[PDB]
Amino acid sequence: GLSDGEWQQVLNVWGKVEADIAGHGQEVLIRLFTGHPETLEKFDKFKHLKTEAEMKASEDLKKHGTVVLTALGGILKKKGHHEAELKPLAQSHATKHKIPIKYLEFISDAIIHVLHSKHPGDFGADAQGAMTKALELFRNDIAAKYKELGFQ
Ligand code: HEM
């Protein structure tokens, strides 16, 4: 549940991500993998990445960063009316990829970190608040589909 003003802040912030979707995507995943090494083990196609140099040097990691943020952006543009978009992602990540809701908390915090890192002093207190709310809404609606499936 976000206000109209809050949704406007979220979509304003997203303009930054849209100027460099791959760069933001790559940094969000690198921050996830480096901060939480177990998350890398969920990706059979990125397990071979033994170093952050290998990570930064991976074209396919950049590619998947674009896939992830494009999907998230689509959802954010629905301003909460995202059932059709979110349900299949929830179901894929629980049933096929086996991703605990904890890892979605990790990637949420990682998005906040990357925005401050790439835009220092240009990601204000109101902006962080609005983006956090959106990411919690997203996370919480996925958690609901996880409880439905009894997935832990
Ligand atoms: C902001 C949250 C995220 C979004 C928007 C997102 C989105 C996506 C999309 C669109 C795909 C491809 C289609 C599909 O399989 O459903 C995908 C694949 C996948 N996701 Fe995510 N995802 C998120 C978070 C996570 C996290 C936190 C992990 C792991 C720690 C994860 C692991 C995977 C894996 C293992 C695949 C398959 C990669 C492959 O082999 O091609 N995801 N994701």
Curated annotation (Swiss-Prot):
Nitrite binds at H64. It is an enzyme of class 1 (oxidoreductase). It catalyses: Fe(III)-heme b-[protein] + nitric oxide + H2O = Fe(II)-heme b-[protein] + nitrite + 2 H(+); H2O2 + AH2 = A + 2 H2O. It is found in: Cytoplasm, Sarcoplasm. Residues 1-147 form the Globin domain. Disulfide bonds: none annotated. It comes from the Eukaryota. Keywords: Cytoplasm, Heme, Iron, Metal-binding, Muscle protein, Oxidoreductase, Oxygen transport, Phosphoprotein, Transport. One of its GO terms (cellular component) is sarcoplasm. Its EC number is 1.7.-.-, 1.11.1.-. GO terms for molecular function: heme binding; metal ion binding; nitrite reductase activity; oxygen binding; oxygen carrier activity; peroxidase activity. Its main location: cytoplasm. Heme b binds at H93. GO terms for biological process: oxygen transport; removal of superoxide radicals. O2 binds at H64. The modification Phosphoserine is found at S3. Belongs to the globin family. Monomeric. Monomeric heme protein which primary function is to store oxygen and facilitate its diffusion within muscle tissues. Reversibly binds oxygen through a pentacoordinated heme iron and enables its timely and efficient release as needed during periods of heightened demand. Depending on the oxidative conditions of tissues and cells, and in addition to its ability to bind oxygen, it also has a nitrite reductase activity whereby it regulates the production of bioactive nitric oxide. This is Myoglobin. The lineage of its organism: Eukaryota, Metazoa, Chordata, Craniata, Vertebrata. The gene is MB.
